[PDB]
């Protein structure tokens, strides 16, 4: 209607890191309204899209997507680890992100 | 070291899952009963549970039955260690020395 959102909103927080070396192969994902890591085993294996724009048209759009998947729960607060076709940019740190509802299980 | 008293349950689950043999070295996975038989059949022992039996009872051939088993190769414990600092005695809230009946839970997390 006014709303069409079929996914949950997310944020690209950090790469996996230690204090002093990061790992672009895993990004860490904050899912809106997901609080425990009990709460976040529901989004395990869901698919994630970071959508973005560009100025060159491509396959007939100026809109692009990087695709990924939740893979495990990260620490006590419902942050989630995830990996992507290509690694998310690092400029994207604190950019939004779509966790979808599929694969499903209800 | 941390050490103590294994149960049949964790001697079972060690041999079955991570037990290999020293067969001209060659660290050989067990995986079939006729691997054992060919080398410990000498002294009885013609089955994997035959191994377990001769181990868990310290029977007449425990030296060659034991040394046949290639030193086990565990992971870091799954739960973690439960101590904060490990290199104290068990009695002093660390991880080493004889913790006895509990050497199991530890092992069944490292397996």
């Amino acid at each position: 209607a006014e709303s069409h959102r079929l996914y949950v909103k997310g944020k690209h927080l950090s790469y996996q890191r230690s204090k002093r070396v990061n790992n672009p192969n895993v990004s860490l994902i904050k899912i809106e309204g997901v609080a425990t890591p009990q709460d976040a085993q529901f989004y395990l294996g869901k698919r994630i899209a970071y959508v973005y724009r560009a100025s060159k048209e491509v396959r007939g759009s100026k809109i692009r997507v990087m695709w990924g998947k939740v893979t495990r729960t990260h620490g006590n607060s419902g942050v989630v680890r995830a990996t992507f076709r290509n690694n998310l940019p690092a400029k994207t740190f604190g950019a939004s992100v779509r966790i979808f509802l599929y694969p499903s299980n209800i | 070291v941390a050490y103590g008293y294994p149960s049949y349950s964790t001697i079972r689950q060690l041999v079955y899952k991570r037990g290999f043999g020293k067969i001209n070295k060659q660290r050989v996975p067990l995986s079939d009963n006729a691997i054992i038989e060919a080398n410990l059949g000498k002294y009885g022992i013609l089955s994997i549970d035959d191994l377990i039996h001769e181990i868990i009872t310290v029977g007449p051939h425990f030296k060659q039955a034991n040394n046949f088993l290639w030193p086990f190769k565990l992971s870091n414990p799954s739960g973690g260690w439960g101590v904060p600092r490990k290199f104290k005695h068990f009695i002093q809230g660390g991880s080493f020395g004889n913790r006895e009946e509990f050497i199991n839970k530890l092992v069944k997390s490292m397996n």
């Binding site: 927080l13 809106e32 604190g94 | -």
Partner: protein, 197 residues
């Protein structure tokens, strides 16, 4: 959650607000802090006066300008508690900072928007009852902050227009919950009641 989060500083402990503001900032959440002068600091006013003076003495020797800059206004003190919790010399830090605004008083837009509170930095919830603490306005004014009277003038007039605003509001919601009572016991209402509403 929201495009911009407006925070009523009044009642909030400096570092514990700075800490949560820093994190909302870095996770992409634009934030605006208001009434910074009504912000709180643990310890009585003297300890925090003394503290600001200790700050105040550090300056580059050969040229006092290139050295540390000391800012007097309750908001710049607040931004300072914040900036040091942000990797502010990086590309990403300048990013996150631009999402943040700090003000004395509640200036336009934000006086008509709703402003929100942070329980985990709320002094009345955080501090132990009986400790002594500091109001950032008094502390600022004692080290050079000029505009403490003007602000409370401008605010004492704000809080008037807003009481009126609230007044009309409370008067209207009396009608609405009035009409809401004629509609009760009807067929609709009792059904919703079943579905939790």
């Amino acid at each position: 959650v929201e495009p911009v989060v407006v925070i009523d500083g009044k009642g909030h402990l400096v570092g514990r607000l700075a800490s949560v503001v820093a994190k909302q900032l870095l996770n992409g959440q634009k934030i605006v802090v208001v009434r910074a002068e009504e912000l709180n600091i643990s310890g009585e006013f003297f300890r925090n006066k003394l503290k600001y003076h200790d700050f105040l003495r550090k300056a580059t020797a050969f040229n006092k300008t290139r050295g540390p800059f000391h800012f007097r206004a309750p908001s710049r003190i607040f931004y300072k508690a914040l900036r040091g919790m942000v990797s502010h010399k990086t590309a990403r830090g300048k990013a996150a900072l631009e999402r943040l605004k700090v003000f004395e008083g509640i200036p336009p837009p934000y006086d008509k928007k709703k402003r929100v509170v942070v329980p985990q930095a709320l002094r009345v919830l955080r501090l132990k009852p009986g400790r002594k603490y500091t109001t950032l306005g008094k502390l600022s004014t004692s080290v050079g902050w000029k505009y403490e009277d003007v602000v409370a003038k401008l605010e004492a007039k704000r809080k008037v227009s807003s009481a009126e605003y609230y007044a009309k509001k409370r008067a209207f919601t009396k009608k609405v919950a009035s009409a809401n009572a004629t509609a009760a016991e009807s067929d609709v209402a009792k059904q919703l009641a079943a579905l939790g509403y």
